Design a protein around this ligand. Structure first.
Ligand SMILES: [Ca+2]
Ligand SMILES: [Ca+2]
Ligand SMILES: [Ca+2]
Ligand SMILES: [Ca+2]
Lengths: 148, 26
């Protein structure tokens, strides 16, 4: 096995923050469910509890950052993830055409309660848009998330 | 700043916990 790098820990801390919307340092079923539903899934409360239980090392019913890190190491360790990123792309690509448009991005962010300004949306698209077509394809999305 | 990453990654964590279920085929 390979020990987690400080760059990976930082990336995962940023990922954890997206789930931990109240910043209380834990991810609850409510928080996990909110994210899942936002990605088009329809889990039941029983399913959500089971999902947390799997990674909940201390049995307190929620996921803390250390538990999240163990989970991410496993995801990277087992095979090499990949499905995670594909399903995420599909959430953003609302019309399923293979490209995330600025409108689609803004719609997702607004739904997630992030009322981005026009300038903020433009910056997200410009930075991900390596080929310059004004939208974000799958490879560009992977590169943006893949991170170093 | 405009990192669709924390947003994507985050969803990646949960999305991964949904697929971790190694096909409940049986
Ligand atoms: Ca929380
Ligand atoms: Ca816990
Ligand atoms: Ca699209
Ligand atoms: Ca592009």
């Amino acid at each position: 096995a390979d020990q987690l790098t400080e760059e990976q820990i930082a990336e995962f801390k940023e990922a954890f923050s997206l789930f931990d919307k109240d910043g209380d340092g834990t991810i609850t079923t409510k928080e996990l469910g909110t994210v899942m539903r936002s990605l088009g899934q329809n889990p039941t409360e029983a399913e959500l509890q089971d999902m947390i239980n799997e990674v909940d090392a201390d049995g307190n019913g929620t996921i803390d950052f250390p538990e999240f890190l163990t989970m991410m190491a496993r995801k990277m360790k087992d095979t090499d993830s990949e499905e995670e990123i594909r399903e995420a792309f599909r959430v953003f690509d609302k019309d399923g055409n293979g490209f995330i448009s600025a409108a689609e991005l803004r719609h997702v962010m607004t739904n997630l309660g992030e009322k981005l300004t026009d300038e903020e949306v433009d910056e997200m698209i410009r930075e991900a848009d390596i080929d310059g077509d004004g939208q974000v394809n799958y490879e560009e999305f992977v590169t943006m998330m893949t991170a170093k | 700043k405009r990192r669709w990453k924390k947003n994507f990654i985050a969803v990646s964590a949960a999305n991964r916990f949904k697929k971790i279920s190694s096909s409940g085929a049986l």
